[PDB]
């Protein structure tokens, strides 16, 4: 939201980058990618979100499965 | 005052009626819960006598308890 | 502003002009005593101190200190 | 969760009946095997000191249905008293209302006792209790005024009374009373309370 142009990663399968996508991130280091310590929350204001998972959909924000 | 909502409490204090409450006190005299009226208190009437000798009028409704302490029998009628 | 401040102004402005007059005449008495030393102006200041210190116009300490100083410097005359 | 849901499923992996033995012993057959489609030979490939500590703690709260925050509450309460804290805690472990009602011959299961207590059929010393976690104390009288004739469960428990010295009861008059603190020998001994109190210093 301020002037801090820094790296980040897209955690999870696929992506929803729009070259202007406003979304939320995650703080945490990744060992294999030096200089990168950031991610993107899947499903915040731009990202679609992924359902049908007993996995994340707690993280990687996605609505509770509907049946 | 203190306590909880639906659970009032107010420790009776012989405090200056012109200075705010919930602060430093020369001497705390008694306590009472106004929710359920049973008149439980820890009044002293020993240093309170000195306070009344040097004014120190407590809060508005303390005079009723003053009647129970019976100080009127020993404070106002003490010159005759 | 509020009406109460207006009433306080309407009062204390005139009370302050009155007090200014009293203080300036006390000042004039002090001046006349500074010109020459005599018992008549000593009595004048004696009266004025009681006129002004009676109310909040002049503090008791200030009046007592000034009269003590004047009578002390008079004691050598 | 307030309830484990399926209670025989709890005895599946544990291999211990919460009843005497009849929980998973007489329902058609005796299914005391651990669950899991991935089931295979497991004799010494899943048991450790940490694992046995978890097993003891798990069966301990399963016997009473204590939630984590209430578990820490009871831990602090038994900290408030001195002596051998493990055995004192175990004595407090019977201070549950539903556990006592089950042990008083007033409910065939502690689960039934809990659901009666929440329903409001119980009277604890002129005070109906809907929370079944209240702490017992010696010298407490209970009543079952009117919500007991329509309940066959409470009567069936009454005829199948339980003998206990730490409490007194007139099951034919629907009367119960907590008399004294319970004795360790009257209770199962496979549980080790020490390891859990060692495990509870993490605040």
């Amino acid at each position: 939201t301020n002037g801090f142009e820094v790296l980040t990663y897209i955690p999870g399968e696929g992506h929803n980058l729009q070259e202007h996508s406003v979304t939320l991130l995650r703080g945490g280091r990744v060992k294999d990618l030096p200089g990168v310590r950031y991610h993107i929350v899947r499903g915040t204001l731009d990202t679609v979100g992924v359902e049908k998972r007993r996995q994340q959909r707690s993280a990687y924000g996605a609505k509770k499965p509907k049946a | 005052r203190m306590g909880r909502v639906h659970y009032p409490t107010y420790r009776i204090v012989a405090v200056d009626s012109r200075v705010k409450r919930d602060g430093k006190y020369i001497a705390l005299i008694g306590h009472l819960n106004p929710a359920l009226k049973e008149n439980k208190c820890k009044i002293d009437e020993a240093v309170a006598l000195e306070w009344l000798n040097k004014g120190a009028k407590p809060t508005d409704t303390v005079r009723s308890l003053f009647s129970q302490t019976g100080l009127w029998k020993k404070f106002v009628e003490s010159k005759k | 502003n509020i009406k109460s401040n207006e009433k306080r102004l309407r009062q204390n402005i005139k009370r302050n002009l009155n007090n200014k007059g009293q203080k300036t005449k006390l000042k004039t008495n002090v001046k006349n005593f500074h010109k020459e030393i005599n018992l008549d102006n000593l009595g004048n200041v004696y009266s004025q101190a009681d006129r002004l210190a009676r109310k909040g116009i002049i503090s008791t300490n200030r009046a007592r200190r000034l009269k003590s100083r004047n009578v002390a410097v008079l004691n050598k005359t | 969760m307030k309830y484990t849901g399926s209670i025989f499923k709890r005895s599946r992996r544990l291999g211990f009946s919460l009843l005497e033995n009849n929980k998973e012993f007489s329902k058609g057959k005796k299914r005391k095997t651990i669950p899991g489609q991935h089931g295979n030979r497991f004799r010494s490939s899943t048991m450790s000191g940490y694992a046995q500590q978890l097993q003891e703690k798990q069966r301990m709260q399963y016997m009473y249905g204590i939630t984590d925050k209430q578990f820490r509450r009871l831990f602090r309460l038994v900290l408030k008293q001195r002596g051998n804290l493990a055995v004192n805690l175990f004595r407090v472990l019977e201070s549950r209302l539903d556990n006592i009602v089950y042990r008083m011959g007033f409910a065939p299961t502690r689960r039934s006792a809990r659901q009666l207590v929440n329903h409001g059929h119980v009277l604890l010393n002129d005070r109906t209790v809907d929370t079944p976690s209240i702490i017992l104390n010696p010298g407490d009288k209970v009543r079952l005024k009117a919500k007991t004739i329509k309940i066959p469960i409470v009567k069936a428990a009454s005829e199948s009374g339980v003998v206990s010295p730490f409490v007194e009861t007139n099951n034919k008059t629907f009367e119960g009373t907590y008399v004294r603190f319970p004795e360790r020998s009257e209770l199962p001994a496979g549980i080790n309370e020490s390891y859990v109190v060692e495990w509870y210093k993490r605040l």
């Binding site: 729009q18 070259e19 202007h20 406003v22 | - | - | -």
Partner: protein, 272 residues
């Protein structure tokens, strides 16, 4: 600026709560933000709210939906990438056929019979093709409608690796595309216009003068109906060219038809 993009998206949030009928698209290829409007006054009032009500200052341009690319008659070239960048040797070499396929996308056919390329390298090379067509030497749009036929290759020792073959295949694809005179395809929308009588000749002359594919008449119950397969660029101002001539009493349906060959004039216009 990208900050201007963000502030214009804030203005979009403000202006979409009143009437969200306007559509906004951020194209992944053309890039410029397309916003829909009714007419001159509608766009004007949107601009007025943007600059005065919202204090948002953004430049205004022209709508962006560009093209597709393909190429001419077939040819066959080879790719030899003997190279290295980082600490050791690298090499790869393949031989593929670059053939157009008018109605089919990427297609692979193998011609390895003498063991020139192991099956392990059959699949990566395909990907090397699938990424190589993405750029064109005229304006850079991806090349589609191509049939690829791998013929030969050479797997060497440890110097050989799969990505080296992919890069060699990419070189071959680009070289053959340069040789085989690439061409462009423009989007074409199918527009149907139904007018009682008034703008028969008007629309006829507009389509004939501007662009479009037409054939005569359709005579509906009491109206004249004309369907034109017209380039999507020709819709620029057509919404008001027809409406102004119709005094606001015009309507049509805009549906995308297909990509069609670009004439030489379009070849001269778009290039820098």
């Amino acid at each position: 600026t990208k900050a201007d993009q963000e502030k214009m998206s804030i203005a979009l949030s403000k202006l979409a709560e009143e009437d969200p009928t306007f559509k906004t698209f951020t194209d992944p290829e053309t890039g410029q933000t397309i916003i829909a409007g009714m007419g001159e006054l509608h766009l004007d009032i949107l601009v007025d709210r943007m600059r005065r009500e919202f204090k948002v200052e953004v430049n205004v341009g022209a709508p962006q939906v560009s093209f597709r690319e393909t190429f001419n008659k077939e040819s066959e070239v080879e790719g030899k990438y003997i190279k290295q960048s980082g600490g050791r040797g690298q090499y790869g070499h393949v031989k593929i056929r670059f053939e157009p396929n008018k109605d089919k996308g990427f297609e692979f056919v193998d011609k390895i019979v003498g063991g020139r390329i192991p099956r392990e390298y059959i699949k990566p090379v395909q990907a090397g093709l699938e990424n190589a067509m993405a750029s064109g030497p005229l304006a850079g749009y991806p090349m589609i409608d191509i049939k690829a036929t791998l013929f030969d290759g050479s797997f060497h020792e440890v110097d050989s690796s799969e990505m080296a073959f992919k890069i060699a295949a990419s070189l071959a694809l680009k070289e053959a595309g340069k040789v085989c005179s690439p061409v462009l395809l423009e989007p074409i929308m199918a527009i149907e216009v139904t007018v009682p009588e008034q703008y028969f000749g008007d629309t006829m002359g507009d389509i004939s003068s501007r662009r479009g594919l037409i054939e005569g008449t359709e005579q509906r119950d009491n109206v004249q109906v004309i369907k034109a397969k017209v380039p999507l660029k020709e819709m620029f101002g057509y919404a008001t060219d027809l409406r102004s001539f119709s005094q606001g009493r015009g309507n049509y349906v805009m549906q995308f038809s297909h990509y069609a060959e670009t004439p030489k004039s379009v070849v001269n216009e778009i290039i820098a």
